[PDB]
């Protein structure tokens, strides 16, 4: 039974410089379109009509300030299809209405799906376990929760992150001022996962590199390794003693070590994702009620928590009118919260 | 049983097939973006976060002397001279909120010079 | 009194903090970069008001 | 009759330490929010 | 401080139920030959 399906299968799984696979059918066009969409947008497209912002090279922005910005708040959660009722097939209007944002976000979503499918597909062809795909579930959770679920919980796509460097920085600052996101234990777990992951990366790499067996004569130790060699290239035993004596505890199991390196950042990212799903509903970790009761009654009570709330209040008042132009916030100078002198 | 029991502390032979991991990852991207050399791979794993965090530390350490982040506040201006806001300007609004509220009783003079 | 303006900030658990809000609070702005060991204080109470533990730590 | 599918369960000492550390640190983290 | 009083028991159980779980598993592991 060598029908067209099997022939096509043959061709798709050829060993070429760039492996295609069945997954490639989904992955390559969507990844290419998301990337191309971002490049196009950041080079040529404005955010004047949706945000009141210049956001492209064409307008004089640089790499840090260009963006593909979210659609106007008035678009709600419209898919903003090019042939949809808002753009009505007009490419130019579509660009001005923020259609590229949903374009990139959606092709990006399916592109990520394609990439993970590719991890599974290649894993299956080569005969390894699919832990790389499984690990990739964490970036997908992050993307889906931050770029899709979060704005879907809010009033519109407008409050999703915009695709740009400074635009993302704004997203960070917004999350501090409005969500008090640093106070969120899910974010905190995410931070532990990421910093702990970076830590593990460094300490594992460094340990290996400094417990190498001398398997060559040269001062460049890189040459003294052969990919098909059976022997471990560094001493697990010496590594273990060193760390046991330096830090008290050490890995003794390599498999557990590398599994742990998978586990820490993956789990961290998943936790942060859960927190953002909460923020979709403004289900924040904003306050400690006991602190507020005490502070409301007792004007001499001050903590870093109350200090930070004052900072958030500043962020909200000073950034809201320009950051949310559709709301038409007019905040006279006299209502702006300010400390002395500043 | 746990796959971890398949490794025994101090065993001389490697517990995974770096050639298979390379075949996989090389096909994931392309062959020449994958490490076949465990030493150079592990060196990379050491170097990337260490160098990165060195720069982070140097950031804090040089902003300690007030050489600050890029300022593109009002960098984009139209033909008449109207300020065209960019995301940098929105960032600046947030920053202003933080600045005016922090240490609300500590400043008597209009500039926060330290 | 972290910022040296006689406005003490509470950092410890016994004084109304939880794990998240708690802190050892930086020494006073009135001290600046001056070295403030325990023996430079007239009393432990002074040393604590002015944030000496921060410097020691 | 005895079920042939029964398997012994294990938790080694290192896993006990790791697990206890996880639970205690999680508690240390969440307790502030439980007290609120 | 007007904390939520359930916090206490919430924390206690949070620590105790899973810890105990681990302890059971560990001890019966040690008692196996």
């Amino acid at each position: 039974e060598r029908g067209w399906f099997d022939i096509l299968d043959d061709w798709l799984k050829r060993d070429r410089f760039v492996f295609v696979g069945w997954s490639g059918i989904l992955l390559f066009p969507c990844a290419y379109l998301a990337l191309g969409g971002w490049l196009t947008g950041t080079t040529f497209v404005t955010s004047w009509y949706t945000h009141g912002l210049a956001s492209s090279y064409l307008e004089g922005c640089n790499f840090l300030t260009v963006a593909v910005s979210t659609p106007a708040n008035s678009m709600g959660h419209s898919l903003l299809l090019l042939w949809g009722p808002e753009a009505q097939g007009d490419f130019t209007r579509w660009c001005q209405l923020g259609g590229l944002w949903t374009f990139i976000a959606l092709h990006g979503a399916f592109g990520l799906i394609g990439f993970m499918l590719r991890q599974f597909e290649i894993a299956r062809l080569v005969g390894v376990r699919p832990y790389n795909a499984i690990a990739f579930s964490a970036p997908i959770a992050v993307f889906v929760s931050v770029f899709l679920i979060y704005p879907l919980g809010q009033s519109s796509w407008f409050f999703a992150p915009s695709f740009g460097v400074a635009a993302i920085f704004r997203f960070l600052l917004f999350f501090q001022g409005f969500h008090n996101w640093t106070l969120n234990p899910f974010h905190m777990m995410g931070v532990a996962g990421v910093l702990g992951g970076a830590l593990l990366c460094a300490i594992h790499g460094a340990t290996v590199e400094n417990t190498l067996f001398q398997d060559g004569e040269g001062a460049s130790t890189f040459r003294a390794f052969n990919p098909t060699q059976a022997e471990e290239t560094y001493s697990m035993v010496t590594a273990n003693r060193f760390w046991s004596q330096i830090f008290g505890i050490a890995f003794s199991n390599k498999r557990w070590l590398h599994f742990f390196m998978l586990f820490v950042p993956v789990t961290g990212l998943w936790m942060s994702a859960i927190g953002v799903v909460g923020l979709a509903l403004n289900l924040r970790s904003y306050d400690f009620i006991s602190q507020e009761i005490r502070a409301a009654e007792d004007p001499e009570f001050e903590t870093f928590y109350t200090k930070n709330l004052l900072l958030n209040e500043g962020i909200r008042a000073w950034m809201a009118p320009q950051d949310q132009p559709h709301e038409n916030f007019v905040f006279p100078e006299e209502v702006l919260p300010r400390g002395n002198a500043l | 049983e746990s796959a971890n029991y398949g490794y025994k502390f101090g065993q001389e032979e490697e517990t995974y097939n770096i050639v298979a991991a390379h075949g996989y990852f090389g096909r994931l991207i392309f062959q020449y973006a994958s490490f076949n050399n465990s030493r150079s791979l592990h060196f990379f794993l050491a170097a990337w976060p260490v160098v990165g965090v060195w720069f982070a530390a140097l950031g804090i350490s040089t902003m300690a002397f007030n050489l600050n982040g890029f300022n593109f506040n009002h960098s984009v201006i139209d033909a008449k001279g109207n300020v065209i806001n960019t995301w940098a300007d929105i960032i600046n609004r947030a920053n202003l909120g933080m600045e005016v509220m922090h240490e609300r009783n500590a400043h008597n003079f209009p500039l926060d010079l330290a | 009194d972290i910022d040296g303006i006689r406005e003490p900030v509470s950092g410890s658990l016994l004084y109304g903090n939880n794990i998240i809000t708690g802190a050892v609070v930086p020494s006073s702005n009135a001290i600046g970069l001056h070295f403030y060991p325990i023996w430079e204080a007239a009393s432990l109470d002074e040393w604590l008001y002015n944030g000496g533990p921060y410097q020691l730590i | 009759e005895p079920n042939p599918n029964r398997q012994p369960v294990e938790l080694n000492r290192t896993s006990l330490y790791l697990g206890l550390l996880l639970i205690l640190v999680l508690a240390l983290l969440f307790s502030s929010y439980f007290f609120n | 401080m007007e904390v939520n009083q359930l916090g206490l028991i919430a924390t206690a159980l949070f620590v105790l139920v899973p810890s105990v779980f681990l302890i059971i598993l560990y001890v019966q592991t040690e008692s196996q030959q």
């Binding site: - | 502390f9 101090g10 | 939880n18 | 205690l24 | -």
Partner: peptide
Amino acid sequence: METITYVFIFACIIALFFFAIFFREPPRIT
């Protein structure tokens, strides 16, 4: 009560450090 709780959990963690370091499974070379 909260304070007692916080400090207790903390104290348990330090105790755990002690046991994990000094009463660990010895790594045994094979």
